[PDB]
Design a protein around this ligand. Structure first.
Ligand SMILES: NC(=[NH2+])NCCC[C@H](N)C(=O)O
Lengths: 234, 234
């Protein structure tokens, strides 16, 4: 039988297409949930969904597992999470010549880009910027350098991914602040899916042990920069 | 209304009594589970039991929550775990003069000190060592120093805490080897305690988000040597 998985499919390197959008669905999260499926003896079924419809696809039962979801207390209330399988940090990016903005605390009434997908709206309310949405990091960079924005807030994973893709890119921008603590990310299911949560959990543990979590991680992230999560025990 | 917790209080810094064994139960896992407890408005009830019957004590409803449990696939099958809250690293410790123990695979035909009824103790039996049963890590370490054993498999948290409390023993032990990954630790519960698990996980999430986690961790660890788990998202 089939393990139905919803995703946006446009968040490199979590869930993206091989290039210009025309190659297969791939990414760290994808290979991992595929691995999980293989180990539950299931053929995985992907449901690419617009960012706005990702949770409501769960609620609606278009699919059963949702990829690349940050744990929030109110999500733990209403849904089931797996054990965390990766984490990220928010970075604050600005123009190289920017001097008035040096911290998350400097963003008050400044206009600040967030790339859709990155789920940063709630963290950004507190902050208390006037917030705009960009399609990808390149788009935001065009806004940043032209001054249509005062900053972009982006999670590190995608940031550093951009830097590996385009690694001789001007030094036209910089990191002005970095989230000290980091934020756990996991698979999300409807509340009640409990047989399903413990298996995922169980497989994720067995994936860590036998060396596959590492394999898959190194395929996509630099271990030196990007935070992993913990291992397991036999 | 009461939240019942299993533990043996002879495991500094996890679980011990103040004033050299004469006072209140305290420790990192203690102070966290109470925090958790106060946030679900529960008075907390401690039941102390030798590690050997901790897990069976949870089978037989002597208490509801076990603290400081390393997640294994086997236990994931038969029990509910919380989100991880800490990580540990499984060290092979020897006397600093010892020359013929360079890996876990050299424990075969060596006298090893492990705690009765633990997985590390199972591991020693499997590696076909001469086992010596200790009643905690302090004794595992004392025995190593008295030459009544030649090694012990011990996680980093209680090992480094011994070294904090007795710094002149610093140079008498050495780490011969480590498991190449660290290992997640969580609260363990009987399968089907799903609303409880959702509640603990929610509260832990808040405990990270307000900086209490950090307060509790820094009370007992050097974040430079002990791995924390990822934080949450608002
Ligand atoms: N990663 C590990 N094997 N940790 C060992 C500690 C877990 C558990 N107390 C035991 O029986 O040993």
């Amino acid at each position: 039988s089939a393990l139905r998985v919803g995703t946006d499919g446009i968040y490199p390197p979590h869930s993206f297409h091989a290039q210009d959008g025309r190659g297969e669905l791939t990414g760290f999260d994808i290979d991992l949930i595929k691995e999980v499926a293989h180990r539950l003896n299931l053929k995985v079924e992907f449901f690419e969904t617009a960012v706005s419809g990702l949770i409501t696809g769960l609620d609606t039962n278009r699919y059963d597992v949702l990829v690349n979801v940050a744990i929030t207390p109110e999500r733990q209330k209403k849904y089931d999470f797996s054990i965390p399988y990766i984490a990220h940090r928010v970075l604050l990016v600005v123009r190289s010549d920017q001097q008035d903005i040096r911290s998350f605390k400097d963003l008050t009434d400044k206009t600040v880009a967030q790339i859709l997908g990155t789920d940063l709206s709630r963290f950004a309310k507190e902050l208390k910027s006037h917030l705009v949405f960009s399609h990808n990091f390149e788009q935001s960079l065009q806004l940043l350098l032209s001054k249509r924005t005062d900053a972009t807030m982006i999670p590190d994973i995608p940031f550093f991914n951009f830097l590996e893709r385009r690694p001789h890119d001007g030094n036209l921008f910089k990191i002005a602040d970095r989230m000290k603590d980091n934020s756990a990310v996991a698979f999300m299911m409807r509340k009640g899916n409990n047989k399903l949560t413990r298996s995922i959990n169980e497989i994720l543990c067995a994936i860590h042990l036998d060396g596959t979590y590492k394999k898959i991680f190194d395929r996509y992230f630099d271990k030196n920069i990007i935070s992993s999560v913990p291992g397991c025990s036999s």
